[PDB]
Amino acid sequence: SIMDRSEIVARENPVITQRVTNLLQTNAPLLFMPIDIHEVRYGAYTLFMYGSLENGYKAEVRIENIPVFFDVQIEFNDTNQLFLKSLLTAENIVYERLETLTQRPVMGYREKEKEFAPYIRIFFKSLYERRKAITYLNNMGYNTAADDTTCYYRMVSRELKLPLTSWIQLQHYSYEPRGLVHRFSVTPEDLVSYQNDGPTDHSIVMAYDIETYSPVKGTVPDPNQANDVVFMICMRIFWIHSTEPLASTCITMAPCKKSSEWTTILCSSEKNLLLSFAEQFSRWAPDICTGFNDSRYDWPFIVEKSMQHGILEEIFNKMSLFWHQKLDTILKCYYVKEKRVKISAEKSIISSFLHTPGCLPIDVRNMCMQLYPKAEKTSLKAFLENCGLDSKVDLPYHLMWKYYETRDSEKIADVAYYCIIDAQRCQDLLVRHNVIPDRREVGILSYTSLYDCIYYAGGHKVCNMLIAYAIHDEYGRIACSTIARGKREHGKYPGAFVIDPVKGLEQDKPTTGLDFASLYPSLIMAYNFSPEKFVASRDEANSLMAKGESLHYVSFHFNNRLVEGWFVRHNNVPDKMGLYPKVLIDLLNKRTALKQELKKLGEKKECIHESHPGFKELQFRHAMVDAKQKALKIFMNTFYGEAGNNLSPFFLLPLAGGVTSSGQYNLKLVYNFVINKGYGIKYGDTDSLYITCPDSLYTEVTDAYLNSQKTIKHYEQLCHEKVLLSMKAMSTLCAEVNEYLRQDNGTSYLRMAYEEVLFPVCFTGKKKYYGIAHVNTPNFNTKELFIRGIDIIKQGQTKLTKTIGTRIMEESMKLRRPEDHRPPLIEIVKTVLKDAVVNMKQWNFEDFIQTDAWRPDKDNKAVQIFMSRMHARREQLKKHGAAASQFAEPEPGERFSYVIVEKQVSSRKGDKMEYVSEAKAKNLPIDILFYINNYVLGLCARFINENEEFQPPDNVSNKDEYAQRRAKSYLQKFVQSIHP
DNA sequence: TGATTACGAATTGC
DNA sequence: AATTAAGCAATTCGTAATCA
Ligand SMILES: Cc1cn([C@H]2C[C@H](O)[C@@H](COP(=O)(O)OP(=O)(O)OP(=O)(O)O)O2)c(=O)[nH]c1=O
Ligand SMILES: [Mg+2]
């Protein structure tokens, strides 16, 4: 009415607008960039793409004549063709035509003279008949290729070499201008991808938020009940790579003062507000729609209110660019309820939204959680202050209630300001973390749409990339399937190897750790762990060796059974390399380049002091590059992870077994080689290996120091020299080890890498060590203390244990001279524990709060009694009549904080748990002895495990557990003795 | 009534 | 007329059942 998309994009980019108008009039090739994808199942299959032109115009491009087909193996016999077509038509399925071709299977190894196998491809119209035919043929027991039953645009993208998340060049099109949209009709032989670097791109993203009200005190509004009401919606538009806005709108009910920044629309009813929201959405036509926590509170609220008022059809049809749809179809198809999104290996979240064609909905909270999966606080303030942005953009709810009760224009203006800022913060986060281009690159690399890049995990991306590389091979075309097959067994196969540490504190010999770089991918490259190079029979392996090939033998144990196999090597020939090695080789170069850039950035940063204003930006850029290379690393490891997954089409147990066995063999070989040279090895884990230097290297500096006055500065100089010679010797040792490995295997893929020097160091057990880190130059007056799994870095831990652990750890590394007093670890632990238990007046009501997750599906024992107790208390409170919202159950999958108090006359956790607010209201003094005896004793016993008096005789097998029990008992007796 | 054990759940390190 | 989801090794706590 006042300002639409076309006028804005013409005002912003006039020259590009004039250019695009000229090309449209002349009917010249254009550029297009997609965001959203939609397709039709019944009837003729046409693919819909919604996106942007160069200047900013919104366009929709429909592709017709996309072939629909799928492949089966069988044979070329005409009798087979007739039999298959008779079977297919016997179940009321209509097909178009049949074709024959030749392809190489993916499973098994064949010689050159019998490599190619026949295939029959069946064509179809509409996806429904194709899916039914695939299911029927697979159930009948026929091998099939292609085989993508869930989504079909992935197959189109991987077959036509047309990324759905990049620029596309339009040639020889049909054009029709309809209102604000530009209908484009194309044909697959048209198009093609844009190889060069495209322009800056111009897409529109709208961030929105809402504010609601309820008449009953202290309750979150619920759409199901009457009254309540949603009473403000504010929205703002932006480019895809910019923070400055283009337009902003506020829709409200109560009167408010006019503001120069935004436009205000005044309604007089709840229906009017939703209608105006839909109208403004239709006029702007966002390409992306965003809001914070909108998938759990906002969208269901609007949808439920609309159904209550019965205006869902109008809103959906005005927002959507697709054709008319009825209410039942909207409810069944375009309204998603309870969708599962994966965050970590043991976490998931539930999302629900409304999907209008022509716009993609994105939740900022999901992206932030996926970026930082180990964060206890998951609110806007926490994520906003983590990245370095300005926090404190929130408003109390009671103040909002009072302001709505008063019905004053200034208060409504203030709440409008706050919700506008809330809308802005989402775009701030999205631009700061650079989210959309990263997912864009992932989709380009994996041949997948952006919706999948936002709402899905990485296994299917791996499968799609493997199939895409297989079908485009230089020496043929390889057929791959997506449907899993074979019997599913329960169990685990052996893997990894950990070396028993020489426990204790080392303050005289520097220790250096060397590890393999990309161990498992390198093993795959070196030994050809590929499905097409696998031999299962012994006779075949014997014959292949007789002819003159080279094979790798694998054997291990699984479920009281021997698993045995062979693989074929490539002896440094490009023609003989497998498919997994090709993909991993292509992926490794990107990580190498990013690592070089990271090293250059670190070198540049090392020359800048902390006081310079530019230090924070350099730190941020360094962190982002590190995150990118870690993201590549996890994607690379997902290949091995999926190779052993029981639900994937690429399941092959011998591959994973051989990978793990070869890792163990290489680690043991390097261990023996280093031992037989005079060095001492203190630790090992999977690939990392920690070594110490001989005693003859430091003779000169030792003799020089022994003839001096023996002051502290002299010992500091001696330590500096020790570390320098340690690095100098370790470089040569690494070079010799790499040469030995290269001679052993015959290939340069496997290689060891230098990390750092740890001096002084302490090993408290398996997977538990700490020390001071030296990278390139010695430096001792630092506070960083490495730390790897010392139980003070976990999630559900109180501040008390962290403080005690830090106090103990930072005291054992103070660089004491040999001639001075060198105190053991036991006295440090005892002194810290005694100063903790005694003098308890140093702890406040902040060191005892601990957080835990509430998962109803999981059983647990302690939380499920606390929940029942709170439910009974709530029922008792509601009986007489009182407020009971203080004891509301947390949302499933979320974490809650709690404290432990004293219960009079029990003796169980869960009968003493209380909420933080309830405890603060009613004092409820804390039991400190419970915290001590249940949490500090284990850590303190782990520190002093190494001592001799706790050791078992030679008969006991598991010495570590026995020693831990004895240390815990000894410390328990000590703590009972010091203060009853 | 005490000591000991077994199994699920939680969380880190590769 | 409906559907996701990489692997294993190692330690620590918490409650109920069985054993002297
Ligand atoms: C981190 C990680 C490792 N692993 C396994 C496979 C790896 O080969 C093995 C050891 O990996 P690391 O030695 O931790 O790392 P890397 O060798 O892959 O790379 P870099 O040295 O540059 O850090 O751990 C997984 O299976 N999944 C994972 O998520
Ligand atoms: Mg490594």
Side-chain angles (χ1 to χ4, degrees), chain A residues 1-375 377-980:
Chain A
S1 54
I2 52 169
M3 185 64 72
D4 56 355
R5 185 177 183 157
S6 298
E7 288 196 11
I8 284 162
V9 298
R11 186 187 65 190
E12 283 296 323
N13 312 318
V15 289
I16 314 188
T17 308
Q18 188 274 331
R19 218 173 65 81
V20 176
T21 301
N22 288 170
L23 288 89
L24 269 174
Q25 290 209 345
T26 301
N27 184 119
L30 270 180
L31 277 187
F32 179 61
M33 184 176 177
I35 296 294
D36 206 358
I37 301 299
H38 200 281
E39 56 181 1
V40 298
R41 290 142 192 82
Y42 315 99
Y45 176 49
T46 61
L47 192 45
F48 286 81
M49 294 182 286
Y50 303 86
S52 63
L53 291 193
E54 214 161 341
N55 57 332
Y57 281 165
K58 186 156 213 304
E60 65 183 1
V61 181
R62 64 180 292 196
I63 319 185
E64 293 83 3
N65 295 327
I66 285 279
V68 164
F69 63 95
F70 80 101
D71 306 344
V72 301
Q73 183 171 0
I74 45 175
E75 212 69 47
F76 285 163
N77 297 339
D78 288 348
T79 67
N80 290 338
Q81 297 191 51
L82 291 178
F83 182 76
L84 190 143
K85 76 176 60 176
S86 177
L87 294 174
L88 184 63
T89 197
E91 217 72 30
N92 293 303
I93 281 297
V94 288
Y95 59 93
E96 294 216 12
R97 57 161 182 300
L98 269 71
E99 280 178 351
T100 46
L101 73 165
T102 48
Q103 294 178 357
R104 305 156 63 208
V106 68
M107 289 288 167
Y109 172 79
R110 306 138 166 276
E111 302 278 340
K112 197 62 64 73
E113 65 183 1
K114 64 182 181 293
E115 181 71 28
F116 280 99
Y119 270 81
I120 281 184
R121 47 178 52 237
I122 310 159
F123 286 87
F124 272 134
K125 181 266 290 180
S126 73
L127 304 190
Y128 185 57
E129 302 174 356
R130 172 194 171 260
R131 184 176 179 179
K132 186 182 287 185
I134 297 169
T135 288
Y136 182 70
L137 273 185
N138 189 179
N139 277 1
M140 185 64 72
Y142 278 62
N143 296 136
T144 47
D147 264 6
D148 204 355
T149 64
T150 309
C151 310
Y152 193 73
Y153 55 92
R154 290 180 206 151
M155 189 174 164
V156 162
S157 185
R158 88 174 168 235
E159 279 265 341
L160 292 188
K161 273 274 192 68
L162 183 63
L164 293 165
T165 311
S166 68
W167 290 100
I168 302 183
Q169 195 180 7
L170 286 151
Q171 319 157 353
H172 275 123
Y173 49 82
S174 171
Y175 171 61
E176 177 188 358
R178 192 176 294 274
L180 188 153
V181 308
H182 300 260
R183 302 281 175 91
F184 282 112
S185 179
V186 293
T187 300
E189 66 253 12
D190 299 327
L191 306 160
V192 298
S193 198
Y194 199 61
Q195 299 300 324
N196 296 115
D197 205 357
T200 65
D201 171 65
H202 289 141
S203 297
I204 279 180
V205 60
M206 176 198 75
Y208 79 98
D209 72 331
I210 79 174
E211 293 179 353
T212 62
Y213 162 83
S214 199
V216 285
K217 298 293 183 182
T219 57
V220 298
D222 172 338
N224 307 351
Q225 295 108 30
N227 293 309
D228 291 309
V229 299
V230 57
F231 84 108
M232 185 179 288
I233 291 174
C234 294
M235 64 184 73
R236 194 172 253 193
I237 45 166
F238 310 101
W239 285 132
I240 191 167
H241 62 75
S242 168
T243 302
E244 294 294 328
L246 305 196
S248 61
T249 300
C250 164
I251 314 176
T252 187
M253 277 183 188
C256 52
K257 279 181 67 177
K258 295 178 180 179
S259 194
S260 297
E261 293 83 3
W262 58 84
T263 302
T264 61
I265 300 179
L266 282 72
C267 294
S268 66
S269 178
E270 183 163 295
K271 184 176 175 180
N272 287 25
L273 189 139
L274 299 182
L275 293 187
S276 283
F277 171 85
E279 207 170 348
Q280 177 92 330
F281 191 99
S282 165
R283 293 179 292 173
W284 274 348
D287 291 331
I288 288 185
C289 182
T290 61
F292 195 56
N293 210 18
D294 56 346
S295 188
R296 286 162 271 269
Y297 186 47
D298 299 359
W299 268 128
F301 200 105
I302 281 154
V303 170
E304 286 290 328
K305 283 288 163 193
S306 303
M307 293 182 286
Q308 173 181 133
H309 288 291
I311 55 179
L312 197 54
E313 273 213 346
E314 286 191 355
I315 285 177
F316 185 89
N317 284 338
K318 211 158 172 43
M319 293 177 70
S320 173
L321 264 65
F322 182 76
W323 51 64
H324 212 271
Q325 304 281 264
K326 308 287 184 184
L327 187 49
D328 45 354
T329 291
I330 285 165
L331 285 169
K332 293 182 183 293
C333 310
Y334 305 92
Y335 190 51
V336 184
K337 287 196 280 323
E338 307 281 315
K339 196 177 183 69
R340 312 177 29 91
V341 167
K342 171 171 173 178
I343 297 186
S344 66
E346 56 263 13
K347 199 172 166 49
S348 296
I349 62 170
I350 289 299
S351 296
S352 50
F353 55 89
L354 187 71
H355 198 248
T356 54
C359 192
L360 185 72
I362 297 169
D363 199 355
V364 187
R365 196 146 171 271
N366 300 14
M367 295 298 102
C368 281
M369 280 198 228
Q370 283 199 47
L371 280 159
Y372 299 125
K374 287 181 185 291
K377 293 182 183 293
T378 317
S379 160
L380 198 53
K381 184 178 184 293
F383 280 133
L384 183 63
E385 78 181 1
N386 168 6
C387 305
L389 294 174
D390 291 331
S391 286
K392 299 289 287 185
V393 290
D394 49 349
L395 189 72
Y397 196 92
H398 43 266
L399 272 184
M400 185 180 288
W401 200 101
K402 189 255 286 183
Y403 287 160
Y404 189 53
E405 188 192 10
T406 49
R407 288 287 180 97
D408 289 332
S409 294
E410 283 78 4
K411 312 308 156 197
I412 305 305
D414 288 331
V415 309
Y417 188 103
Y418 284 125
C419 57
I420 286 296
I421 296 307
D422 199 353
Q424 177 97 63
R425 289 271 95 64
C426 315
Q427 188 62 249
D428 274 25
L429 265 166
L430 270 181
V431 176
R432 179 63 173 228
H433 275 284
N434 189 359
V435 180
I436 300 163
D438 286 7
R439 314 271 171 153
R440 279 224 173 110
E441 292 307 5
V442 176
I444 284 167
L445 188 153
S446 51
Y447 288 135
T448 306
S449 62
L450 183 62
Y451 180 82
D452 297 337
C453 292
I454 283 151
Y455 284 109
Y456 283 109
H460 72 96
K461 298 177 175 54
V462 167
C463 291
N464 213 50
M465 184 177 177
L466 276 295
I467 300 166
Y469 265 66
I471 59 174
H472 280 143
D473 210 5
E474 293 83 3
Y475 315 94
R477 184 178 182 271
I478 277 159
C480 308
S481 182
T482 310
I483 310 189
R485 255 176 283 253
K487 297 296 289 183
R488 295 179 66 250
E489 305 181 28
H490 310 133
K492 304 198 191 143
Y493 56 85
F497 184 70
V498 194
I499 292 179
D500 295 20
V502 178
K503 311 180 190 68
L505 195 146
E506 193 66 34
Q507 47 192 347
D508 280 2
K509 298 299 179 185
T511 309
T512 293
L514 317 176
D515 61 339
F516 284 95
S518 304
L519 176 55
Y520 284 6
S522 305
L523 288 154
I524 294 158
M525 307 179 197
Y527 297 101
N528 290 138
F529 278 135
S530 280
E532 60 263 11
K533 310 273 188 183
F534 167 80
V535 184
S537 176
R538 170 102 65 181
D539 311 335
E540 194 174 13
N542 196 4
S543 168
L544 260 51
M545 277 159 177
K547 293 182 183 293
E549 292 275 332
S550 171
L551 303 186
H552 184 67
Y553 174 79
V554 57
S555 64
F556 64 92
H557 271 101
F558 186 66
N559 267 356
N560 182 1
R561 175 170 50 96
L562 196 72
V563 171
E564 187 172 0
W566 302 258
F567 278 96
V568 186
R569 297 188 94 186
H570 69 290
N571 64 7
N572 272 325
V573 160
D575 186 74
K576 295 176 73 68
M577 185 180 288
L579 190 153
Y580 278 60
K582 267 170 189 192
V583 180
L584 276 296
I585 280 176
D586 291 331
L587 273 166
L588 192 64
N589 303 351
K590 294 181 176 67
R591 206 191 165 195
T592 310
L594 282 165
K595 283 177 97 66
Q596 293 179 356
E597 182 65 26
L598 184 52
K599 182 175 73 175
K600 293 182 183 293
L601 294 174
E603 269 193 356
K604 185 175 289 293
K605 180 182 81 172
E606 282 179 354
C607 306
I608 292 302
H609 282 294
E610 304 267 327
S611 298
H612 291 175
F615 183 63
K616 299 171 185 176
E617 195 171 1
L618 267 297
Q619 265 190 343
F620 180 79
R621 190 60 190 281
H622 199 261
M624 294 296 172
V625 179
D626 207 341
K628 215 159 153 76
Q629 63 84 30
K630 293 182 183 293
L632 279 175
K633 170 180 144 166
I634 50 174
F635 190 70
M636 269 171 92
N637 295 335
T638 311
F639 283 62
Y640 151 71
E642 194 95 5
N645 192 12
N646 202 2
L647 298 164
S648 280
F650 288 123
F651 177 63
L652 208 51
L653 206 68
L655 192 149
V659 161
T660 49
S661 197
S662 297
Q664 275 191 354
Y665 167 76
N666 281 113
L667 188 74
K668 286 182 181 178
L669 183 135
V670 173
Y671 183 83
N672 275 325
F673 173 74
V674 176
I675 284 297
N676 280 326
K677 203 170 270 294
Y679 292 78
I681 297 169
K682 286 189 96 76
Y683 197 32
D685 188 7
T686 300
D687 64 334
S688 76
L689 191 152
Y690 292 75
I691 311 170
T692 195
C693 291
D695 206 5
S696 65
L697 183 63
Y698 318 88
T699 48
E700 296 205 350
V701 298
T702 311
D703 290 331
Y705 168 69
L706 294 174
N707 264 323
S708 87
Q709 301 294 321
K710 310 175 154 285
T711 76
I712 177 65
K713 175 69 75 63
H714 293 62
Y715 193 93
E716 295 293 328
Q717 219 58 45
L718 187 152
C719 278
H720 281 223
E721 289 157 335
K722 282 191 154 184
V723 179
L724 285 190
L725 282 71
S726 296
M727 312 182 185
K728 188 210 153 181
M730 277 311 155
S731 180
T732 307
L733 177 60
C734 188
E736 300 175 10
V737 163
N738 284 344
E739 169 61 37
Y740 178 44
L741 267 170
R742 186 201 92 51
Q743 187 66 40
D744 185 74
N745 53 23
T747 302
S748 179
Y749 289 135
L750 282 173
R751 185 177 65 247
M752 287 211 85
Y754 181 76
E755 186 69 29
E756 46 167 2
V757 163
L758 288 150
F759 181 81
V761 74
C762 185
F763 291 63
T764 79
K766 201 172 282 187
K767 291 183 187 287
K768 278 168 187 182
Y769 54 96
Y770 64 101
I772 290 179
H774 303 299
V775 182
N776 285 338
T777 44
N779 179 11
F780 285 117
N781 46 11
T782 64
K783 265 69 64 178
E784 202 268 336
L785 215 49
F786 206 51
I787 287 172
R788 282 266 191 287
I790 304 299
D791 190 359
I792 78 164
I793 62 170
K794 304 205 172 170
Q795 276 201 85
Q797 296 278 319
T798 61
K799 194 175 292 293
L800 191 63
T801 76
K802 288 193 224 294
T803 303
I804 295 170
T806 289
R807 279 180 186 177
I808 294 172
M809 284 178 39
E810 72 179 5
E811 186 89 0
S812 54
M813 295 176 163
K814 282 181 75 175
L815 294 174
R816 282 161 278 242
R817 292 185 277 134
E819 55 256 40
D820 299 343
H821 187 53
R822 255 179 191 184
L825 213 51
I826 296 166
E827 64 87 20
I828 296 160
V829 159
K830 291 173 94 166
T831 302
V832 164
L833 210 50
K834 197 186 176 187
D835 203 274
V837 169
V838 183
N839 189 359
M840 271 164 153
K841 277 74 69 177
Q842 68 171 5
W843 300 327
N844 304 344
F845 195 76
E846 294 293 328
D847 306 330
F848 306 112
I849 295 90
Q850 51 184 352
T851 72
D852 189 358
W854 157 241
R855 294 179 66 188
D857 43 7
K858 291 299 182 182
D859 189 14
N860 209 346
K861 277 306 198 323
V863 66
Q864 273 205 6
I865 316 178
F866 182 50
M867 290 324 199
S868 299
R869 284 180 42 227
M870 295 288 109
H871 181 204
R873 186 181 310 207
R874 184 145 40 74
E875 280 326 289
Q876 175 184 2
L877 269 172
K878 183 175 174 66
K879 181 257 296 179
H880 182 74
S885 197
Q886 295 180 355
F887 304 136
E889 282 197 352
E891 295 180 353
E894 214 166 341
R895 291 177 74 90
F896 63 98
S897 311
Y898 62 94
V899 76
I900 299 194
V901 298
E902 285 186 353
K903 287 296 179 184
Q904 287 85 19
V905 293
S906 64
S907 179
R908 286 164 81 206
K909 198 183 180 182
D911 299 336
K912 303 164 84 169
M913 285 202 228
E914 301 282 299
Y915 278 133
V916 182
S917 47
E918 190 277 331
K920 268 180 75 82
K922 316 183 155 304
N923 288 345
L924 281 189
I926 304 146
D927 195 7
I928 317 182
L929 277 296
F930 186 89
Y931 272 120
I932 290 282
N933 273 293
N934 276 279
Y935 296 132
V936 191
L937 274 298
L939 172 62
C940 291
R942 172 57 74 189
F943 283 164
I944 62 170
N945 178 356
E946 196 259 333
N947 197 12
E948 183 178 1
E949 44 191 287
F950 308 140
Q951 293 304 313
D954 210 4
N955 57 328
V956 193
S957 59
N958 63 6
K959 309 199 287 180
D960 187 74
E961 206 272 331
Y962 182 77
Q964 175 81 356
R965 292 182 183 271
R966 295 291 185 269
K968 206 164 177 223
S969 293
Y970 166 85
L971 280 172
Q972 183 180 299
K973 293 182 183 293
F974 176 65
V975 65
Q976 293 179 356
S977 179
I978 53 171
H979 187 70

